Every structure is written in C-alpha cells, then in structure tokens.
Amino acid sequence: MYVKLISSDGHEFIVKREHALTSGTIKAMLSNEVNFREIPSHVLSKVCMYFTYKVRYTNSSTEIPEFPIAPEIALELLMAANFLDC
Amino acid sequence: VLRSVNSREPSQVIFCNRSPRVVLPVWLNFDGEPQPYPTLPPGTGRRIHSYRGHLWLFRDAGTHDGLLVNQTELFVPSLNVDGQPIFANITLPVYTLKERCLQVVRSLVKPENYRRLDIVRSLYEDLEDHPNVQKDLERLT
Amino acid sequence: MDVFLMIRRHKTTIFTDAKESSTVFELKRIVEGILKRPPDEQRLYKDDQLLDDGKTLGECGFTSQTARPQAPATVGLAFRADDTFEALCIEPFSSPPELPDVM
Numbered sequence A: 001m002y003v004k005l006i007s008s009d010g011h012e013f014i015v016k017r018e019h020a021l022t023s024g025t026i027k028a029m030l031s032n033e034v035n036f037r038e039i040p041s042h043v044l045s046k047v048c049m050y051f052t053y054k055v056r057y058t059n060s061s062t063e064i065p066e067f068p069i070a071p072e073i074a075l076e077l078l079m080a081a082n083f084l085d086c
Numbered sequence B: 001v002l003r004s005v006n007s008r009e010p011s012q013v014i015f016c017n018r019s020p021r022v023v024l025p026v027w028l029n030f031d032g033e034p035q036p037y038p039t040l041p042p043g044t045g046r047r048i049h050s051y052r053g054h055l056w057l058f059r060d061a062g063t064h065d066g067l068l069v070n071q072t073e074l075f076v077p078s079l080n081v082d083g084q085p086i087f088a089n090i091t092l093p094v095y096t097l098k099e100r101c102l103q104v105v106r107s108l109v110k111p112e113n114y115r116r117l118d119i120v121r122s123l124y125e126d127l128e129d130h131p132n133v134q135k136d137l138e139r140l141t
Numbered sequence C: 001m002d003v004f005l006m007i008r009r010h011k012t013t014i015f016t017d018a019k020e021s022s023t024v025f026e027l028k029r030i031v032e033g034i035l036k037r038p039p040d041e042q043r044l045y046k047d048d049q050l051l052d053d054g055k056t057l058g059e060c061g062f063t064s065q066t067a068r069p070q071a072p073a074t075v076g077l078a079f080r081a082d083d084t085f086e087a088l089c090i091e092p093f094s095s096p097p098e099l100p101d102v103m
C-alpha cells in the first residue's frame, strides 16, 4: 500500500503508506494523495529519503551512517521537518 | 541522583567510536558532576580503566549532540567475565529530521546570526536551544 | 541484499526497495502494481542504457552499497503509448535558492 505526496511544483512522490506515517501531520492529512503547497520537490524528495532511512535504521544493530543534507537545502528542509513533525 | 557508585571495583572497558563524530566521553562523578575525558577521533578505540557502577555518556565533542552507547543513553561498566573488558559501542542515533536540520544550520550560521534567518520565531529558539549535558541530566532525572 | 531506488518518469518518482538478486522484469511487476501499466508497456533504464528483462538489478549495477536508503539510485522509466515507446524523460527536481549571506 502506497500514498502519493505531491510537491508545490507538481512532482508526485509515491512512497509506502507506513513510511509516510512517520509524520504525524501526514497521517492527519490522510485521515490518499496529499498536496504540499509549500514544499518544493528538491525538499520533498529528501523528506522521502529520510523516511526510508529511518525505517531501515531504527532498531538496527548495524552501524548507522550520517543522514546527509546539502547546505543549500538545509533551511527549507528544516521548515518542512518542523511542519511535518519528523 | 544520577551519579557513579563508589564501588572501588575495577572494570576494564573498550570505548569504540563507530560514529563519524569526534567523541567526548563524560563520566558522572560521585556528586553527579559531569567530568570530561580525552576525546576519541572517528572510527577509533581506547582501552580504559573504570569501575563497576560508574556512569558514562558520550557526546559529539564539538557540538555536544547526543550519541548512543550499546543502543542507550548511559553506559555502566559491569563485572568483567574471565578477564575480558566490556565493550562500549558508540554510534550515531537516528536523529529526527528536524534535529538533523538544526545540526546542519547550526554548523553553518554563527549564533549571533540565527535571528537574521528568514524563519518562524519558534525555530530561532530551537536553534539557540543547543544540545547540552546539564539539560539532559535534568531530563534523564 | 536490499537496494533502494527511485523509479522516475516525467514528474513521477516511486521510492521502493528490491533485492540485488531480483530481475528487471520483476521490478516492472512492482511498477505495474503501482502505476497500473503492464511490463510490456514499460522500458526501464540506468542512465541512458535500456535494461534487459532477465538481468538482475545487481548485474545492472544496482548494489546495496550504492543504492542506499538515504541516497537511492535512479531507475528511469518510459511508457509505450499505443504502438510505440515515448523517449525517456525525467523532469529535474526544483533548484534550491541562493545560500543566505549568513550561511
């Protein structure tokens, strides 16, 4: 089961529903597409990579790599993360 | 409350930094005061002499971001079985995306300038509220 | 070993994982379940290279240590409209703004 997260510039990101439920805000927006009028694709694609990263490395014994964030997207990513509470 | 027990029972320990950070080990002394110890570079290890019931935590030496040790906040050396030291495996947590963004923004902007960033006032306060051992000791208590 | 992928076409991007041992055709069956288009109406690519159905994702250079959860590898996707295939087209993501002076 998948959900579609749509960026402000119209990019459609398809991710597993349980990955998207990482975010309490998305759960509420679902209760199955969600449009994000303020999150551009270069931020939302990273958000989706974070979900994959979290689900994979949460409760795992294998060494955990740093989650990478380019300086240029850090500010917008922060704002997105704060809105999405993740 | 959070303090080492004065057991006087040696316990050898390997600190193993499996993180990409420079690690600051912090010993909580018998009155609960945090005592810093020599840092470990990324991917390195140290054999150290500690004691049963002693309390340790580990931070990024530069930023004070939290780190895990055998998957938890605190490490307490136990009885050495058959001469073998205890393994203290230090790793990154899975930070929230928000705390991770705050780390990167802090690393690029001097605290003087947090107010110049075009963001909601509540995020300026989030940036200023740096990680810090004292705050976590109060929390863990 | 799991590989983490973005399957991309036009302004569509699927985040999914697959086995290194799994095949190109099997990835098309995954795409089929999501976008409701059968394998024969799909072409998959690595960069500009057309991937053959029987090859494993590993053989086509999608390995566990390159296709990572926090940095997934891109597989291009093109549909067949009726008789002939469209060309591979992947709309780039938006551009980040200029670093503020303070950064």
Ligand SMILES: CC(C)(C)CC(=O)N1C[C@H](O)C[C@H]1C(=O)NCc1ccc(-c2cnco2)cc1
Binding pocket: B025, B027, B037, B038, B039, B046, B048, B049, B050, B051, B054
């Ligand atoms: C009151 C006391 C400081 C003398 C008790 C004591 O001996 N402690 C407190 C802790 O249990 C550790 C132990 C100690 O200080 N051992 C010596 C030591 C020296 C270097 C290092 C070290 C080396 N690299 C990182 O840390 C760790 C321990």
